[PDB]
Structure 1
Amino acid sequence: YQPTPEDRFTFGLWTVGWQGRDPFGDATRRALDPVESVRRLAELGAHGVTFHDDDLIPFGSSDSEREEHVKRFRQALDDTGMKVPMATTNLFTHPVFKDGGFTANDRDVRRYALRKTIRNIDLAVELGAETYVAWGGREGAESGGAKDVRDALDRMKEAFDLLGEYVTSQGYDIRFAIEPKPNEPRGDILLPTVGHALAFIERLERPELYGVNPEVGHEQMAGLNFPHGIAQALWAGKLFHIDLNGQNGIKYDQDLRFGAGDLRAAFWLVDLLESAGYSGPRHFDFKPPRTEDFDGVWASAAGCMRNYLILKERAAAFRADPEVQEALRASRLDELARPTAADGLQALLDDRSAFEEFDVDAAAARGMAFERLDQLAMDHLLGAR
């Protein structure tokens, strides 16, 4: 289960670089130089890294400081063969963003948020990023009067439309991926799920430029089925990027290593990504727990990739097993994939087999055989076949 760069595993600088500060806790690890993170991730068999602007270039850097930070980072990428497939803006840490970036009540803050984003889009394109993620972590409210959500969605549409006008004006190939989260750090965050983000994108001026960047733990913070949400994103043609991690249900955002948290959901996610032929990065947005030293950081990062590769093997073995193929037919997964009424509406209306002569009791009596299918899935996951 040894990852290489072909497996397209990527990590945020902020993941292995997390110093362990939490709502109740000071740092437990020293800051990592991005150069060291690129080297150590490459040694583990990562394909690439991603960054917020402020991960790579300290906030308030001079042009000369910015140039030197990017030069050193570029040299580490060159030394290792590591890629940068995705970049994003920090519109959440600085206190100026305490009520939002794109949907701050203060108009001057909204304008600044856009300029900060646009500066980093240029850098993302220079470093070869195909995807530009937006996580509006400060967009939302703790109280009902603070935020008129129709006005906020007007401001959010304006911001994303301006970014689309910018990338079109420059002739950039980069596309946007909106990252939903239901809450934390705001009491409620706007576009709280994959569904809300997909729906919003349909009302942008150039919807083709925008998709989603769903995160395992974020949908699970609303108690939702992450594989189901990824299936709806794939169905819409909008899975531009994905964030992989672990979460133990409806809590604060844990950012456990991938495979931790809901293990069976991780299995069905990998099964879906691989069956669908998702071709994007397998990106880990996780935090090595603050209990760990740097040896534990690299162990946790290695475990992200290991767990993906184990689950990939077990899901492929499940789908390829003739006994599973028979069980899928027994459960009418083949019939689910057939059109209901390719004969058309009038034929359906005229079909006595669909109403007057439909034996509801005979149909009702037919077991779905889902438990046998699911125990074959369990046996494959556990290597108990």
Structure 2
Amino acid sequence: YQPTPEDRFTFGLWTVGWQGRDPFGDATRRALDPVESVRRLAELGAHGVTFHDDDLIPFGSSDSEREEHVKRFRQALDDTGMKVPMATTNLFTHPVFKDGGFTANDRDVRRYALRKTIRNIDLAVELGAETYVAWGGREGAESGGAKDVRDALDRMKEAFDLLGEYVTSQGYDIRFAIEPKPNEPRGDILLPTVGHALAFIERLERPELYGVNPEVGHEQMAGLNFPHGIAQALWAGKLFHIDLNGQNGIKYDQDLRFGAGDLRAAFWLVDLLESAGYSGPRHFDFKPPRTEDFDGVWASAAGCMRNYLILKERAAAFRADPEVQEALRASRLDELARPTAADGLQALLDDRSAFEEFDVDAAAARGMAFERLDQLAMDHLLGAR
């Protein structure tokens, strides 16, 4: 279970660089220089790193300070062979974004947010990113009267449309990925789940440029099934990126290392990504707990990759087991994949076997055999086959 760069494991600078400040506590770790994080992640077998603008260039920097920060970063990438497959903008930390960026009630803040984003799209392309993520963490409300959501969705569509116009006019080869979250830090966030994000995208001027970046813990904060949501994003052709972590149910976002939280969900998620041939980055958006020193930060990071690789082994074993393939036929997964009425509507209507002569009692008596199938999955996960 040793990772190599071909496994496409990536990490944000803000993940291992989290200093441990929380709602009730000061930092427990000092700040990490991005150059150090690049070197240490390369040693652990990572493929690449991601960044918000402000992780890499401290807010307020001059053009000369900005150039120095980039130069040093690019040298660390050259020294390690690390890639940058994705970048994003910080439109949530600075006080100016307290009511949002793209959907701030103040128009001047909206225009600023757009300019800050465009400046970092340029840098992202320079560094070789192919996906630009957008997490609207401040887009929302704590109270009903503060945000007219129809107007806010008009302003969110206006912003993404302008960004699509910019990337096309410049000829860049980069696509956008919208990251939903249901709440935190706002009491409710706009586009709160994968579904809302998918639906919004279909009303953009150039929908082909936009997909989703779902995060395990975010969908779990709404109690939803994360592998099901990913299945719908794949079905729509919109899974452009994914953020992997863990979460123990409906509560604050924990950002535990991947494999922690709902372990069975993590197994079915890896089964799906590997079966569907997802070829994008396996990005970990996690926070080493603030109980840990730097040795525990790197242990937590290594654990993310290790657990993905164990689960991949076990899901492949499950799908290759002749006994499991028999069990899938016993539960009629083969029949689910066949069309209901390839013969057409008129044929269906004239088929007495579909209604007038259908024996509903015979059909109802047939067991689905799902519990034997799920115990074989459990036995495979635990290495008890």
Structure 1 counterpart of 2:100: 100
Superposed CA offset, 1:75-105 (max 9, x none) = 0100100000000000000000000000000
Displacement, 1:125?
0.1
Displacement, 1:360?
0.6
Q: Secondary structure at the match of 2:217?
A: helix
Structure-2 separation of matches of 1:23 and 1:320: 47
Q: Secondary structure at the match of 2:122?
A: helix
Q: Secondary structure at the match of 2:205?
A: coil
Structure-1 separation of matches of 2:306 and 2:130: 25
Structure-1 separation of matches of 2:344 and 2:92: 51
Instruction: Report the TM-score, using the length of structure 2 for normalisation.
Output: 1.00
Structure 2 counterpart of 1:51: 51
Structure 2 counterpart of 1:137: 137
Displacement, 1:12?
0.2
Displacement, 1:333?
0.5
Structure 2 counterpart of 1:8: 8
Structure-2 separation of matches of 1:100 and 1:268: 35
Superposed CA offset, 1:243-263 (max 9, x none) = 000000100000000000000
Structure-1 separation of matches of 2:172 and 2:345: 45
Q: Secondary structure at the match of 1:356?
A: coil
Q: Secondary structure at the match of 2:11?
A: strand
Superposed CA offset, 1:49-70 (max 9, x none) = 0000000000000001100110
Superposed CA offset, 1:187-241 (max 9, x none) = 0000000000000000000000000000000000000000000000000000000
Gaps of 5+ in 1: none
Runs of 4+ in 1 over 4 A off after TM superposition: none
Structure-2 separation of matches of 1:254 and 1:171: 39
Mapped pair 1:148 → 2:148: yes
Displacement, 1:108?
0.3
Structure-2 separation of matches of 1:30 and 1:148: 41
Displacement, 1:299?
0.2
Displacement, 1:173?
0.8
Structure-1 separation of matches of 2:362 and 2:77: 64
Q: Secondary structure at the match of 1:169?
A: helix
Superposed CA offset, 1:321-355 (max 9, x none) = 00000000000000000010000000011111110
Displacement, 1:122?
0.2
Superposed CA offset, 1:151-179 (max 9, x none) = 00000000000000000000001000000
The residue correspondences of 1:1-385 to structure 2 (distance < 5 A) are 1-385=1-385
Q: Secondary structure at the match of 1:120?
A: helix
Structure-2 separation of matches of 1:65 and 1:260: 39
Displacement, 1:273?
0.2
Structure-2 separation of matches of 1:56 and 1:340: 53
Displacement, 1:144?
0.2
Structure-1 separation of matches of 2:329 and 2:286: 38
Structure-1 separation of matches of 2:248 and 2:353: 47
Displacement, 1:290?
0.3
Structure-1 separation of matches of 2:215 and 2:313: 22
Q: Secondary structure at the match of 2:367?
A: coil
Structure-2 separation of matches of 1:306 and 1:352: 55
Displacement, 1:380?
0.3
Gaps of 5+ in 2: none
Displacement, 1:314?
0.2
Superposed CA offset, 1:266-325 (max 9, x none) = 000000000000000000000000000000000000000000000000000000000000
Displacement, 1:113?
0.3
Displacement, 1:15?
0.1
Structure-2 separation of matches of 1:93 and 1:51: 14
Q: Percent identity?
A: 100
Q: Secondary structure at the match of 1:319?
A: helix
Instruction: Report the TM-score, using the length of structure 1 for normalisation.
Output: 1.00
Q: Secondary structure at the match of 1:136?
A: coil
Structure-1 separation of matches of 2:195 and 2:214: 10
Q: Number of aligned pairs?
A: 385
Structure-2 separation of matches of 1:9 and 1:134: 20
Aligned-CA RMSD value: 0.3
Superposed CA offset, 1:116-169 (max 9, x none) = 000000000000000000000000000000000000000000000000000000
Displacement, 1:23?
0.4
Structure-2 separation of matches of 1:360 and 1:43: 61
Q: Secondary structure at the match of 1:180?
A: coil
Structure-1 separation of matches of 2:263 and 2:347: 45
Structure-1 separation of matches of 2:198 and 2:116: 24
